[PDB]
Design an enzyme around this catalytic site. Structure first.
Site, PDB file in Angstrom:
ATOM      1  N   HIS A  14       0.773  -1.286   0.038  1.00  0.00           N
ATOM      2  CA  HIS A  14      -0.055  -0.149  -0.031  1.00  0.00           C
ATOM      3  C   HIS A  14       0.905   1.237   0.107  1.00  0.00           C
ATOM      4  O   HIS A  14       0.337   2.323  -0.046  1.00  0.00           O
ATOM      5  CB  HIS A  14      -0.836   0.035   1.265  1.00  0.00           C
ATOM      6  CG  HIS A  14      -0.636   0.253   2.467  1.00  0.00           C
ATOM      7  ND1 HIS A  14      -0.363  -0.950   3.440  1.00  0.00           N
ATOM      8  CD2 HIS A  14      -0.055   1.363   2.971  1.00  0.00           C
ATOM      9  CE1 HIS A  14      -0.204  -0.429   4.575  1.00  0.00           C
ATOM     10  NE2 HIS A  14       0.257   1.106   4.506  1.00  0.00           N
ATOM     11  N   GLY A  22       2.109   5.384   9.882  1.00  0.00           N
ATOM     12  CA  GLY A  22       3.631   5.489   9.613  1.00  0.00           C
ATOM     13  C   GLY A  22       4.387   4.277  10.151  1.00  0.00           C
ATOM     14  O   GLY A  22       5.416   4.221   9.742  1.00  0.00           O
ATOM     15  N   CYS A  41       3.443   1.312   9.545  1.00  0.00           N
ATOM     16  CA  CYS A  41       3.311   0.281   8.553  1.00  0.00           C
ATOM     17  C   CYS A  41       4.776  -0.106   7.977  1.00  0.00           C
ATOM     18  O   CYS A  41       5.783   0.705   7.864  1.00  0.00           O
ATOM     19  CB  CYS A  41       2.326   0.457   7.341  1.00  0.00           C
ATOM     20  SG  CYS A  41       0.734   0.888   7.987  1.00  0.00           S
TER      21      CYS A  41
END
Ligand SMILES: Cc1ccncc1CC(=O)Nc1cccc(Cl)c1
Ligand SMILES: Cc1ccncc1CC(=O)Nc1cccc(Cl)c1
Lengths: 304, 304
Positions: B41, B143, B145
């Protein structure tokens, strides 16, 4: 979202751990620059631990009697000295992995990460607090001595603790990096009294703000309190008395959530007086006191 | 003595964290050998996150559109590919700090350490468990991720988790290092159902043996139980059914303490049926299920 008992990333401290042996005794050492710091009881034997005369014992030890090993390579010891309850072994090589660092003596209530070690090797990292009575509720076994407690501000490691002993009560005692014990403890295998432990009120309040930030709001009530009224309750429940200094440090969390410090104290008062009633706050069935207001802000904002 | 929610020392994983940017989106990446792994993503914008067509979005991306930064130095991207929900960015340089490692897909109930990161920098480390419903109760912000979950066996790092999303429920979802989500979760900003979460019975039993090892023995009773009788209670309290496999893995802890697995189940049965009665076990007012039998043995014996 979510709230965890998070420790500081231990990498900078891992590169500092060494194994220090002297006679039959082996423990952990902390290698920063050309100096290795470790507990002075490394020079003791089991007979000595009852009432060791460290100055007399150390006089039978030469630089060559201290075996310092980083990984699988040996460090040449060119000097030794005792500073309070720690030994500083001067080595001929500066640690290439020495991070930017400070030696700090923390206040009770403050928190820190411990990197538990055995034979100079790291086994795990956990977050803990200096109890008001100057003990720590750690997780340490024989050979863990020399393991250090620290904090990290961006790239600087502030070393605040060095593990020395476990009290007959199962709680842990140690020194700052100048070898001064926290509390009244002495490095002897003797029965030692730790103070009455109290709950760190400012930390519980910080953790209640952390619960509100993360969705757990059931404990918020229609009430407020005063510092004096709150402290009458805190006294009874062996909670640390709350001061305007504590209220000031809770300022950012109060501003973030819009819940006045005294309104949060009123929620804590009702929680102390009526318990949790089988409910939980942040996955805990008791009031957590091991997160400072600083720890809450850092975790909820992602400080790296 | 003492028992803590200990994480693995994170140093080996710290040396692998990088920052990966693509367009306006920045997240964490995992640099092992000449490959950078991150959530797919990273190629999405806020409009895309509702129902992203990853194959179409990735086709508008070239190697130069992926900005990989380790510390303050840039990595040259020579290849890119999608594997399930992760992107593998081939870089021209092998990570000099790549530890010995494996990619492992854990079972629910197993535990692991998370090194939470932001902009490729580590903020903290904590121990957590893969819930039976394949979610994790982590501590993650926007953030985070790309942050990874891992285990360490002496010098080998087994990477088991990569953080991808937070469900509207506040719980966390992610993949193994091949990009396969744990559970039924998909990488879309949509309402997703996590299963009914159950308590990891074998882990609670392991933690009751950890309490006995460390002095907390009040919950030990004069009773015993059968697997079938125990599971009738476990079913009611949404506890995982106990099997002979779980009993077998509790074997070492049973041998260490001399308390038969079924006698410990009987203590757990009485604890489920009568609560803690205001008491605590290992500083906890609830039954802890985030320590596997392996974690208990490792911590109580000092495995490094
Ligand atoms: C067995 C253990 C468990 C946890 N932490 C440390 C230990 C060893 C320990 O207590 N050492 C000790 C004892 C009395 C005095 C002095 Cl100087 C040192
Ligand atoms: C805000 C936040 C907090 C904790 N962990 C992660 C995040 C960001 C997040 O949830 N991302 C996301 C959302 C839906 C789908 C996908 Cl693919 C990714």
């Amino acid at each position: 979202s979510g709230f965890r008992k998070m420790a500081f990333p231990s990498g900078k401290v891992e590169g500092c751990m060494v194994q220090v042996t002297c006679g039959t005794t082996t423990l952990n050492g902390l290698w920063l620059d050309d100096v290795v710091y470790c507990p002075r009881h490394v020079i003791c034997t089991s007979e000595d631990m009852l009432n060791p005369n460290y100055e007399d014992l150390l006089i039978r030890k030469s630089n060559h009697n201290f075996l310092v090993q980083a990984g699988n390579v040996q460090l040449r010891v060119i000097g030794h000295s005792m500073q309070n309850c720690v030994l500083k072994l001067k080595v001929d090589t500066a640690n290439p992995k020495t991070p930017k660092y400070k030696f700090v003596r923390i206040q009770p209530g403050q928190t820190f990460s411990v990197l538990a070690c055995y034979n100079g090797s790291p086994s795990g990292v956990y977050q803990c607090a200096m109890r008001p009575n100057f003990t720590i509720k750690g997780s340490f076994l024989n050979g863990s001595c020399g393991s250090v407690g620290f904090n990290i501000d961006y790239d600087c490691v502030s070393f605040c603790y060095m593990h020395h002993m476990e009290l007959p009560t199962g709680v842990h005692a140690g020194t700052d990096l100048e070898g001064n014990f926290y509390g009244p403890f002495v490095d002897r295998q003797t029965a030692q009294a730790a103070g009455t432990d109290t709950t760190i009120t400012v930390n519980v309040l910080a953790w209640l703000y952390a619960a509100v930030i993360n969705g757990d709001r059931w404990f918020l009530n229609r009430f407020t309190t005063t510092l004096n009224d709150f402290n009458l309750v805190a006294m009874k429940y062996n909670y640390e008395p709350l001061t305007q200094d504590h209220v000031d440090i809770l300022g950012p969390l109060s501003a973030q959530t819009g819940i006045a410090v005294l309104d949060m104290c009123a929620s804590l008062k009702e929680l102390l007086q009526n318990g949790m009633n089988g409910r939980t706050i942040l996955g805990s069935a008791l009031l957590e006191d091991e997160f400072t207001p600083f720890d809450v802000v850092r975790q909820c904002s992602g400080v790296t």
